[PDB]
């Protein structure tokens, strides 16, 4: 047993980094615009590109479109990739994020990449990054004694 | 050995469960700004959960400095990451 064991990151490709960037929402969701989000998208694109990722951005997709796109990526081969990264930049609450028109439960997105559903990522890191609110509590400042 | 089908996921959240997360209208979100700064500086050398912990510290140092709602002034945010990883993760130059 090797306490220093590392994932093998010597494949031909680093792998794909998907970014789902959501700035505006269907009027009836009553969600404000997310000014500054394209700054995040561009910042992430640069940093992940520099680490070797093939970065693919999608802007303001509807839920059906987003789910199709994520299903697509989960079914292509990652055999020659080190890992997989998926970023969501949006509104959220509870355990869901918003596409343009509807909420999506985070478990629906991650379930597509579980070992039995995505064989070529078995044994490889599957990294999800979520910028979104997760409820209506506003954390308060404290100081140590 | 076989592997669990649930293994080797890393879920990186900008804030802990149940909380608001903050976004600056020009610079972007607190979390992504600090994640990206740490990626730029340490991405190619530090272990990734080690790096995410630094992001936790950076974001925890921030506060709502100005706000139309005076009750929101000084409010805070701690990120949260969940690891089902089984090994050290590095992004050394390929």
């Amino acid at each position: 047993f090797d306490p220093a064991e590392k994932y093998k990151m010597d494949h031909r490709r680093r792998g794909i980094a998907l970014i789902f960037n959501h700035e505006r929402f269907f009027w009836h969701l009553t969600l404000p615009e997310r000014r500054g989000t394209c700054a995040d998208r561009d910042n992430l694109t640069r940093r992940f590109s520099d680490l070797g990722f093939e970065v693919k951005c999608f802007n303001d997709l509807k839920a059906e479109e987003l789910l199709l796109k994520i299903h697509e990526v989960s079914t292509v081969s990652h055999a020659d990739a080190d890992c997989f990264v998926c970023v969501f930049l949006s509104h959220g609450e509870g355990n869901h994020i918003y596409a343009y028109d509807a909420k999506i439960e985070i478990q629906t997105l991650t379930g597509l990449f579980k070992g039995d559903k995505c064989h070529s990522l078995v044994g490889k890191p599957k990294i999800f990054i979520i910028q979104a609110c997760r409820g209506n509590q506003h954390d308060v400042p404290v100081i140590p004694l | 050995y076989t592997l669990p089908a649930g293994a080797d996921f890393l879920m990186c959240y900008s804030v802990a469960e149940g909380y608001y997360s903050h976004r600056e209208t020009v610079n972007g979100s607190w979390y992504i700004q600090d994640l990206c700064e740490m990626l730029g500086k340490y991405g190619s050398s530090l272990e990734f959960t080690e790096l995410l912990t630094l992001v936790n510290r950076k974001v925890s140092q921030r506060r709502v400095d100005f706000c139309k709602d005076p009750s929101a002034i000084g409010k805070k945010q701690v990120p949260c990451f969940a690891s089902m990883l089984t090994k050290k993760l590095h992004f050394f130059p390929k």
Binding site: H91, G92 | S21, H22, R23, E24, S29, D65, C67
Partner: peptide
């Protein structure tokens, strides 16, 4: 600063 805005809330997500």
């Amino acid at each position: 600063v805005e809330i997500x």
